[PDB]
Design an enzyme around this catalytic site. Structure first.
Site, PDB file in Angstrom:
ATOM      1  N   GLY A  90       8.633   3.753   0.533  1.00  0.00           N
ATOM      2  CA  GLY A  90       8.157   4.074  -0.797  1.00  0.00           C
ATOM      3  C   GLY A  90       6.890   4.902  -0.782  1.00  0.00           C
ATOM      4  O   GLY A  90       6.855   5.987  -0.191  1.00  0.00           O
ATOM      5  N   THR A  91       5.848   4.394  -1.429  1.00  0.00           N
ATOM      6  CA  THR A  91       4.521   5.032  -1.529  1.00  0.00           C
ATOM      7  C   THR A  91       4.717   6.422  -2.147  1.00  0.00           C
ATOM      8  O   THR A  91       5.519   6.574  -3.080  1.00  0.00           O
ATOM      9  CB  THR A  91       3.829   5.029  -0.177  1.00  0.00           C
ATOM     10  OG1 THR A  91       4.588   5.806   0.759  1.00  0.00           O
ATOM     11  CG2 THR A  91       3.703   3.610   0.346  1.00  0.00           C
ATOM     12  N   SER A  92       4.024   7.445  -1.653  1.00  0.00           N
ATOM     13  CA  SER A  92       4.108   8.779  -2.228  1.00  0.00           C
ATOM     14  C   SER A  92       4.128   9.816  -1.118  1.00  0.00           C
ATOM     15  O   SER A  92       3.267   9.800  -0.233  1.00  0.00           O
ATOM     16  CB  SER A  92       2.936   9.047  -3.179  1.00  0.00           C
ATOM     17  OG  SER A  92       2.999  10.359  -3.708  1.00  0.00           O
TER      18      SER A  92
END
Lengths: 243, 233, 250, 205, 242, 243, 244, 241, 86
Positions: D9-11
């Protein structure tokens, strides 16, 4: 009875005819090639012979690049060479995928040797009519050269040679290692080992090569590239000026 | 004769030929004689049926493929059913997938791909049956001559069988005649009857020995046997 | 496509033998001349490295490979037929033992698996028998040191000392009077050097001779300490400087 | 999405400009509740001039990223030098037949001497499209507003870094699943350059 | 010693070409197709008097309205009848009817081409083609009574009067002038035995020959030894008359 | 012992292969075909020998197109030539599935190079006795290749094969020396038909038919199509004017 | 073409017999001999190794007599390589019967399993037949002591005294005249030992080239004792027979 | 595996593999049998070349396929085992599939049907074994004796022999035995079988094995002492008559 | 010396008939197509067999069907003899 010379089986003389006939098919092109091991790298030089003007010299190459760290030089018919070239690239890329890192030169010559024996021991297929010579610089032994064969036996050499004049090339290069008692060239720069191999190649073959008459592969550390017609011609000019 | 390589199809002759391919051509040369031709909007095939006895019947030399197309039998009889089955599947495959009728030009390349696999590999054999593919599509009427060697070429008309090449002289002199005949199926079939008559040697054309099939735009593929061809004799 | 030869290339001769195996022993008797000897304190095997080219590197060639850490092998035959056989010998050793019994197979149980691969090539079609003869020697915790001679026919026999190669006729006869019931590991090394030296037609040194001995378990060559169960492998190969040490000892 | 599997996930994002394209990501990987590895790296190199990031299930990305290295290695030596469109299609077919078992987001961006930089993002469905800027993951869900208005076409190298540095700053403070140091790779006509930040730098504005 | 698919300069195959000559090595099967029925017959050819007449059966039954006979080597005949009975009964399952005699022949004759080594595209395993000749007889609602012949070459012909085996030449020539479209069923039975009396090595009786028939109502029927013996006594009256 | 020429995989004692040499002899028994390489593309040409007047004009396609920009022409047995194109079409279709953008010319040669070589390794199948000439406009420049029965190939600035291969290849050397810097695609169309008529002296005993198909980026812009309209008749009158 | 190189291993001769099977029988005469005798209280097996020497290892080795079961011992006359294939499959099937029915396997079932394997390669497979022969010896509660033999053709019957190996007709002549129905285990060892001495190619007879595995039944009933005689125990019976 | 077809038609129309396989029977032991009214007998010989063969542990020449039907082979004793094992599996399979005990006619068509497969199957060789199947069908007292030839042709015979010296015994069964009037007792069927073996066995005892098959699932094999009783009575009525 | 072509065989076959007597109704280009890959020796045997047919049939001159029937007669690659494969 008389089929001993057709398919590979134990002969009444204790030999293999098809294996011996395979060495005669490696010289069909009649191309002499030699490679010497520099200090930090290894250089290889092969004859570039274009029979017809309709052939593009840039497209014609007898030296294939298996990977960035592994070069390959083949002496023999191109159809059996490209068949083993596309196959060697499949097994070399399989090692990086399966084992995670880059294959050294001794292992690639070992796997292709056992594969070339499948072309021999099996009676329903034929051995390759080419000799795969791999030029690469490993992370442990450094510069190394391993020469395969249609029999499937790989062995390392100091200065490898091929062609019909191989006997004249090996004998001429033997006097350099036995006199200096060194296993490799002490030249650190990769440009010096290129001009060094050309000098002993001209005197042994008795022929003055041109820009399109040679193909010089250069295998450095973690990099491999093939010199173009401009780089090969530049080295030939500096040799005639200095020597 | 009967020397060099008779063993397999994968071994090349020193003269640059293939004996097994040349031996398959002899089946059509000594097989049942048949002729054929075509016009712009129509195509007509004529075959001469044979048998081993007077009390026996006469096998049909024309097998119906689809409504718009068909083939003819020459050379080896039993090998015709093998290529006819693979051809009818491709005709139905195009209708159940592409929903289009199989063109005559594309039908020749399908049978050429089936016979080339047996010649290039051991264990198979080229089918020595002759096939004349006729049909009508948006382009027009087309005729093909199939050979075990894999030669497929569109022609106005041809003849394959016993002494069949001797009937091609009538097709050359009349080549400028039947090609200009459109919408006249009666006079077009009579052109093929006079062509096979030049190849008649022992017997002549009879009621049961004459097999004529015609295909066109307004007239689909129809096999005329028995007394239906008695008017064209 | 595939393979259209399913028939056995080895057929029974009218004299009651097999033509492929009868000619397989000829290729073994002509070639590199190896040897081996078994003692009470270990097994000593040795072989000569032939030079096809003066620029060939002997360090890149291993004439004595490693099947299991306790068992070595040496071959007098052709190179390629040895590598594929040993590469398949390590697979059947790890699959049938390391992946089942968990330990390494002994000398008697390993030679049965190695000879099982060669005996199948003499029958199943599409393949030819192996023209090499392997000497399987090792040590276990029960039977002790044992040396087996694997023939190209697929049959194996135990031997106290044996030699196979061009000098197999003269060397094997000499080993009859050079062997007795009490010998050490280092004492059998000098026996292997006196026998091989007479068979060397080329340069005599440690680079052209591969000498491998099976001694006591070495903790230094193991790579880790702290486990009393594994004291290290018994198989050891003497380096170029270590072989030259006992050459002048004769 | 299974229950208990490691996810990324995260960016992750990349911004094209005149002289090339620069990618970006963070070092934080949130597995379930806790954070498994905060020092890790989501960057993957299938070629010197071709880079790709990893988002979604971590077990799905690292497995597909290695398969592409095997296909392009065969494509580099045999066929020729790969491009951005060729490498983007390899991730596409691996996310098609394996879509049921393997579901992960992929963003591929590379440099070329002809088309310069290109960014090809692959969502969970497996589609491939050309965009000047592309974001994916759980952290990038909050930066859609800031990245769209402040984006410009054919920017410089300093303006591209400041655009990504300020963009990923919103994906961290506002989303706990993303954070750590910001890892960025630069693709220009010179070569590959590595760039990394620290939490005490971009958070101070 | 070569492949089974090897062509000949004559334009034909090897193998099957010899199977055609293997038909004369067996018995002689004779049959005649009339408008009132098809009369079939075979020759048991007992080499010893201790052989049972009811033992050797060269006439099998594929369907109630469809039956055939075998001649020559009977080893390959059993393998064809197993598929012939299957293809006819399985066709009854699909189409809920009786397969045509001509349509069934095309499916049976396709078994002679199955010889080959390592066929590609599908699995067809046959060492040698069928060296047995079958005369396929029956009746339908369209063309009427039909008598076919299954050749090892893969083709078939519809014969009005056919003689196979050792009588493919001498006995076949007599069927030309002795056949007529108006020939009845009773007169056809004595006509078959008229030729079978001359072509048989030993004397003609019920134990040395077995004949069958196919009609529209009763379909396939095998003549009993009592019915056959009555036709032998009537045959002697037809031979010597004036 | 005799039998070196019976099988395929059996090697001759001289180092050659009879099945390969006999396959080359079958190449010279077919209809001739040539080709011309330009800067922006390549030009293909073929001479189909007309048997009788029963042949319908321009209904026989000698030059088969693979994908779009890749043309193929062959001289030899008909089924062996069509099988390589049908196999090459599946290679170009399977490539675009995984690899997106179409396969270039030098990469497509490796597909047929390994495929034909696989037939010479096994005795179960036979090699191709047809010489396939394929080329087109790739991503960088252009390339042209001629597949030999042995599987050997290189870059060809010009190609000649068939019965008139002797006289056609001699005319290709004159075209190279005429325009050493470069040759336009429109001029090569008329020069392709001129070389065919110069090589027609051997085939003059029968009827001929001209079929020319070219591909370049100047007009079709990456499309390989035939020549129709007044462009085909213009090249006929220009080539026959010098006769 | 695959027809030329194929020698047609399995075909019928004009005389109505098989080629490779007759050639495989000659390999038995050129291999080590195997002799066995079925006595009242047990079965005595014997064999001789071919091409031996002083450098051979006699400590623990047997190249002929193998143990496929606690109650069943065999003998190998023929090629050793072809035996190792069947010895492995024999121990599998022998234990499969114990894995299923949970009881000891008799000899007759064990023989026919390996006999059908030999028949498979002769009928089909296009391969060569096994050039190894076996002599099966065991005991059960059905027929009692059983002694069988095998051939590359795959045919087997029962034998009271059988000799398979070098000098087949020479060894069977001396065994038939001295055979007795009341012969015990101790008397059967002397008869099998004296036959190997006269029928060998050497001058004297040592304990290194001899191999003996008998079957004895003591006070324990239902289970026999299979013991392979070591060279220490082989030199002991040489004095009792008088050969020394 | 091996797909090459061994069976090839000779230019005369015969088959080398089938013709040469028939001589494996003519070189084998003579198997002769006869059938009476309510009984059937199958005799066989044994090779006298080798001695010291234990009778108990030796497999009988007549193998038992089922209770009411047996099988007697000849020729090669090797390939005969493949036919016996597959026939016994079909005996339990046909009993399981159709819930009916196997008959003599079905068992003969199966054994002959298996032999027809190997002739038509590429890569295998036909059997050189000729088997004689005899028995009694369920609820049927009529004996059925069917001959199975290696070529795959089956036939019924009242008295027929196979193996070596066949033409000598066949001429003996066509004179002293009548097909239309077979013996109505079991003792006459045994004495006829012994006389047929006197022209082959040539004065022997332990080499003669005779198996008597009786209805209602009754199989009694004559021992060595019971066979010698019939030999004594025949030799007294032979030289004296 | 490759095998003569269509128009090449038509000229060779016609020259061997210069010493014969015909009605000049024979089309030699038609006979060239019936000859498939025949050498110069096989072409001469066609005119020899054509003369033998007129001797049995009693024809005073060799007509066109004699050359066509001469090909069906056994010369090269010809067998016939009541052999029909259907």
């Amino acid at each position: 009875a008389g089929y001993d010379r057709h398919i590979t089986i134990f002969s009444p003389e204790g030999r293999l005819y098809q294996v011996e006939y395979a060495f005669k098919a490696t010289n069909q092109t009649n191309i002499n090639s030699l490679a010497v091991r520099g200090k930090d790298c290894t250089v290889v030089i092969s004859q570039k012979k274009v029979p017809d003007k309709l052939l593009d010299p840039t497209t014609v190459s007898y030296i294939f690049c298996i990977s960035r760290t592994i070069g390959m030089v083949v002496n023999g018919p191109i159809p059996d060479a490209r068949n083993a070239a596309l196959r060697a690239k499949a097994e070399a890329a399989e090692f990086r995928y399966k084992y995670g890192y880059d294959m050294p030169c001794d292992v690639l010559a070992k796997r292709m040797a056992n594969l070339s024996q499948i072309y021999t021991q099996r009676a329903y297929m034929r051995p390759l009519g080419v000799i795969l010579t791999f030029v690469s610089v490993d992370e442990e032994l450094g510069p190394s050269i391993y020469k395969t064969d249609p029999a499937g036996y790989y062995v390392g050499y100091k200065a490898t040679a091929t062609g019909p004049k191989q006997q004249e090339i090996t004998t001429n290069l033997e006097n350099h290692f036995k006199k200096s008692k060194i296993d490799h060239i002490n030249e650190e720069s990769w440009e010096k080992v290129v001009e060094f191999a050309i000098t002993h190649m001209i005197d042994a073959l008795g022929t003055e090569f041109s820009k399109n008459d040679l193909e010089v592969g250069v295998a450095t550390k973690d990099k491999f590239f093939t010199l173009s017609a401009e780089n090969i011609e530049e080295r030939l000019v500096a040799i005639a000026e200095q020597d | 004769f009967r020397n060099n390589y008779d063993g397999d199809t994968v071994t090349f002759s020193p003269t640059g030929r293939l004996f097994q391919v040349e031996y398959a051509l002899e089946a059509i040369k000594q097989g049942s004689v048949t002729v054929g031709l075509r016009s712009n909007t129509h195509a007509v095939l004529v075959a001469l049926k044979r048998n081993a006895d007077e009390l026996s019947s006469y096998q049909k030399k024309i097998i119906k493929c689809d409504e718009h197309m068909g083939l003819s039998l020459a050379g080896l009889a039993p090998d015709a059913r093998v290529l006819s089955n693979y051809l009818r599947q491709q005709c139905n495959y195009s209708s159940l997938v592409f929903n289009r009728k199989l063109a005559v030009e594309r039908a020749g390349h399908l049978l050429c791909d089936k016979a080339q696999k047996n010649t290039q590999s051991y264990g198979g054999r080229p089918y020595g049956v002759g096939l004349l593919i006729i049909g009508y599509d948006k382009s027009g009427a087309h005729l093909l001559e199939f050979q075990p060697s894999g030669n497929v070429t569109e022609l106005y008309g041809t003849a394959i069988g016993a002494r069949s090449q001797g009937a091609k002289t009538y097709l050359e002199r009349t080549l400028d005649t039947f090609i200009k005949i459109d919408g006249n199926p009666d006079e077009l079939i009579k052109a093929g009857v006079e062509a096979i008559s030049q190849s008649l040697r022992d017997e002549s054309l009879t009621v049961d020995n004459l097999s004529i099939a015609i295909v066109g735009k307004d007239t689909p593929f129809t096999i005329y046997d028995g007394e239906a061809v008695a008017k064209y004799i | 496509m595939t393979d259209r030869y399913s028939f056995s290339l080895t057929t029974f001769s009218p004299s009651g033998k097999l033509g492929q195996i009868d000619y397989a022993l000829t290729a073994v008797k002509q070639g590199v001349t190896s040897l081996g000897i078994k003692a009470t304190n270990g097994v000593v095997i040795a072989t000569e490295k032939k030079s096809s080219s003066p620029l060939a590197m002997s360090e890149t060639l291993s004439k004595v490979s490693l099947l299991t850490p306790d068992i070595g092998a040496v071959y007098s035959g052709m190179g390629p037929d040895y590598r594929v056989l040993v590469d398949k010998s390590r697979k059947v050793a790890h699959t049938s033992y390391k992946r089942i019994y968990g330990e390494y197979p002994p000398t008697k149980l390993l030679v049965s698996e190695v000879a099982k691969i060669m005996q199948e090539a003499t029958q199943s079609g599409g393949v030819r028998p192996f023209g090499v003869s392997l000497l399987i020697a090792g040590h276990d915790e029960f039977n002790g040191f044992s040396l087996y001679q694997v023939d190209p026919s697929g049959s194996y026999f135990p031997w106290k000392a044996t030699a196979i190669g061009k000098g197999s006729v003269a060397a094997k006869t000499f080993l009859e009077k050079r062997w007795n019931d009490e010998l050490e590991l280092e004492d059998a090394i000098h026996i292997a050097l006196l026998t091989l030296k007479e068979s060397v037609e080329g340069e005599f040194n440690g680079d052209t001779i591969e000498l491998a001995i099976i001694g006591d378990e070495n903790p230094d060559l193991l790579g880790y300490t702290g486990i009393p169960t594994d004291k290290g492998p018994r198989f050891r190969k003497l380096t170029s400087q270590e072989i030259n040490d006992r050459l002048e000892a004769l | 999405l299974k229950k208990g599997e490691v996810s990324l996930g995260t960016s992750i994002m990349a911004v094209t400009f005149k002289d090339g394209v620069i990618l970006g990501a963070d070092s934080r990987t949130t597995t379930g509740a806790y954070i498994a590895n905060r020092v890790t790296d989501k960057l993957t190199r299938v070629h010197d001039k071709i880079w790709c990031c990893r988002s979604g299930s971590a077990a799905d990305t690292q497995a597909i990223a290695d398969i592409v290295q095997y296909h392009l290695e065969l494509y580099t030596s045999q066929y020729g030098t790969p491009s951005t469109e060729t490498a983007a299609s390899v991730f596409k077919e691996l996310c098609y037949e394996n879509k049921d078992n393997l579901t992960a987001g992929i963003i591929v961006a590379g440099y070329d001497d002809k088309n310069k930089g290109e960014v090809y993002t692959i969502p969970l469905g497996g589609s491939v499209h050309k965009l000047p800027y592309a974001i994916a993951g759980s952290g990038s869900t909050f930066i859609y507003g800031y990245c769209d208005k402040n984006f410009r076409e054919n920017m410089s190298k300093e303006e591209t870094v400041d655009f990504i540095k300020h963009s990923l700053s919103q994906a961290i403070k506002w989303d706990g699943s993303s954070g750590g140091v910001i890892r960025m790779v630069v693709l220009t006509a010179a070569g590959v350059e590595r760039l990394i930040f620290y939490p005490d730098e971009y958070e101070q504005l | 010693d070569r492949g089974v698919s090897t062509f000949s300069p004559e334009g034909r195959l090897f193998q099957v070409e010899y199977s055609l000559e293997a038909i004369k090595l067996g018995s002689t099967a004779i049959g005649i197709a009339t408008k009132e029925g098809v009369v079939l017959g075979v020759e048991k050819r007992a080499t010893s008097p201790l052989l049972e007449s009811d033992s050797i059966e060269k006439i099998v039954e594929i369907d109630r309205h469809i039956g055939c006979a075998m001649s020559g080597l009977t080893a390959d005949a059993r393998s064809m009848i197993e598929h012939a009975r299957t293809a006819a009964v399985t066709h009854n399952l699909y189409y809920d009817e009786d397969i045509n005699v001509e349509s069934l022949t095309q499916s049976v004759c396709d078994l002679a081409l199955r010889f080959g080594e390592g066929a590609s595209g599908e699995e067809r395993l046959m060492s040698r083609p069928f060296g047995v000749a079958l005369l396929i007889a029956g009746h339908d609602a369209d063309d009427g009574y039909q008598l076919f012949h299954a050749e090892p070459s893969g083709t078939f012909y519809r014969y009005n009067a056919k003689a196979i085996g050792s009588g493919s030449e001498g006995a076949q020539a007599e069927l030309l002038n002795e056949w007529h479209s108006s020939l009845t069923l009773k007169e056809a039975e004595l006509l078959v035995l008229k030729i079978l009396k001359q072509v048989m090595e030993e004397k003609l009786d019920e134990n040395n020959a077995q004949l069958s028939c196919i009609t529209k109502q009763d379909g396939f029927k095998i003549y009993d030894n009592e019915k056959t013996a009555e036709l032998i006594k009537e045959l002697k009256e037809k031979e010597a008359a004036e | 012992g005799t039998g070196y020429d019976l099988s395929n995989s059996v090697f001759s004692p001289d180092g050659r292969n009879f099945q390969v040499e006999y396959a080359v002899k079958a190449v010279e028994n077919g209809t001739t075909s040539i080709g011309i390489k330009c800067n922006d593309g390549v030009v293909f040409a073929v001479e189909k020998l007309i048997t009788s007047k029963l042949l319908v004009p321009q209904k026989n396609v000698k030059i088969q197109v693979v994908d779009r920009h890749i043309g193929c022409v062959y001289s030899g047995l008909i089924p062996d030539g069509r099988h390589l194109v049908n196999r090459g079409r599946e290679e170009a279709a399977s490539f675009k599935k995984l690899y997106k953008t179409p396969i270039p010319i030098p990469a497509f040669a490796d597909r047929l190079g390994q495929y034909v070589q696989a037939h010479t390794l096994y005795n179960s199948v036979r090699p191709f006795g047809v010489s396939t000439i394929f080329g087109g406009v790739d991503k960088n420049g252009a390339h042209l290749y001629m597949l030999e029965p042995s599987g050997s190939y290189w870059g060809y600035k010009g190609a000649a094969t068939g019965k008139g291969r002797q006289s056609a290849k001699a005319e290709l050397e004159k075209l190279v020396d005429h325009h050493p810097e470069g040759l336009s695609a429109r001029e090569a169309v008329k020069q392709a038909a001129k070389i065919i008529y110069l090589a027609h002296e051997d085939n003059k005993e029968k009827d001929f038919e001209l079929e020319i198909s070219w591909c370049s980026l100047s007009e079709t812009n990456g499309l390989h199509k035939f020549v129709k309209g007044d462009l085909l008749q213009e090249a006929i009158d220009f080539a026959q004017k010098e006769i | 073409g695959s027809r030329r190189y194929d020698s047609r291993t399995t075909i019928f001769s004009p005389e109505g017999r098989l080629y490779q099977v007759e050639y495989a029988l000659e390999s038995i005469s050129h291999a080590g001999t195997a002799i066995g005798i079925m006595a009242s209280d047990g079965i005595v097996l014997a064999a001789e190794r071919k091409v031996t020497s002083t450098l051979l290892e006699q400590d623990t080795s047997t190249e002929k007599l193998y143990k496929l079961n606690d109650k069943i011992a065999v003998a190998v006359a023929g090629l050793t390589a072809d035996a190792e294939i069947l010895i492995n499959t024999a121990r599998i099937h022998a234990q499969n019967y114990l894995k299923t029915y949970n009881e000891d396997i008799p000899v007759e079932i064990l023989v026919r399993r390996l006999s059908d394997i030999k028949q498979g390669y002769t009928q089909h497979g296009g391969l060569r037949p096994f050039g190894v022969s076996f002599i099966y010896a065991g005991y059960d509660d059905r027929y009692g002591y059983q002694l069988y033999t095998s051939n590359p053709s795959g045919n087997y019957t029962g034998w009271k005294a059988i000799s398979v190996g070098a000098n087949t007709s020479a060894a069977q002549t001396l065994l038939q005249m001295d055979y007795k129905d009341d012969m015990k285990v101790d008397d059967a060892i002397e008869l099998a030992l004296k036959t190997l001495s006269k029928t060998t190619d050497s001058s004297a007879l040592t304990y290194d080239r001899l191999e003996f595995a008998t079957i004895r039944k003591g006070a324990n009933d239902g289970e026999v004792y299979q013991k392979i005689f070591k060279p220490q125990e082989i030199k002991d019976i040489l004095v009792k027979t008088g050969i020394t | 595996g091996y797909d090459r077809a061994l069976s090839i038609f000779s230019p005369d129309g015969h088959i080398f593999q089938v013709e040469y396989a028939l001589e494996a029977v003519k070189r084998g032991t003579c198997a002769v049998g006869v059938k009476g009214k309510n009984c059937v007998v199958l005799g066989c010989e044994r090779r006298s070349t080798l001695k010291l063969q234990d009778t108990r542990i030796t497999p009988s020449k007549v193998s038992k396929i089922d209770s009411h039907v047996v099988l007697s082979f000849s020729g090669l004793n090797a390939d005969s085992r493949i036919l016996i094992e597959k026939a016994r599996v079909e005996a339990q399979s046909h009993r399981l599939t159709l819930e009916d005990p196997v008959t003599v006619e079905y068992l003969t068509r199966y054994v002959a049907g298996v032999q027809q497969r190997y002739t038509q199957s590429g890569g295998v060789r036909p059997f050189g074994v000729s088997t004689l199947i005899a028995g009694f069908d369920p609820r049927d007292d009529e004996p059925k004796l069917y001959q199975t030839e290696p070529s795959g042709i089956y036939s019924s015979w009242s008295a027929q022999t196979i193996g070596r010296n066949s033409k000598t015994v066949r001429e003996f069964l066509e004179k002293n035995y009548d097909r239309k009037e077979p013996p109505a007792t079991v003792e006459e069927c045994v004495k006829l079988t012994v006389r047929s073996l006197l022209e082959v066995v040539q004065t022997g005892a332990k080499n003669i094995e005779i198996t008597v098959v009786k209805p209602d699932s009754d199989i009694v094999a004559l021992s060595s002492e019971e066979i010698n009783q019939y030999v004594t009575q025949i030799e007294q009525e032979k030289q004296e008559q | 010396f490759p095998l003569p072509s269509e128009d090449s065989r038509a000229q060779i076959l016609q020259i061997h008939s210069r010493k014969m007597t015909t009605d000049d109704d024979i089309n030699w280009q038609e006979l060239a197509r019936s000859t498939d890959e025949f050498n110069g020796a096989q072409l001469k045997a066609v005119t020899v067999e054509a003369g033998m047919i007129a001797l049995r049939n009693g024809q005073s001159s060799v007509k066109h069907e004699d050359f066509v029937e001469g090909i069906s007669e056994v010369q090269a690659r010809k067998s016939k003899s009541v052999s029909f494969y259907a």
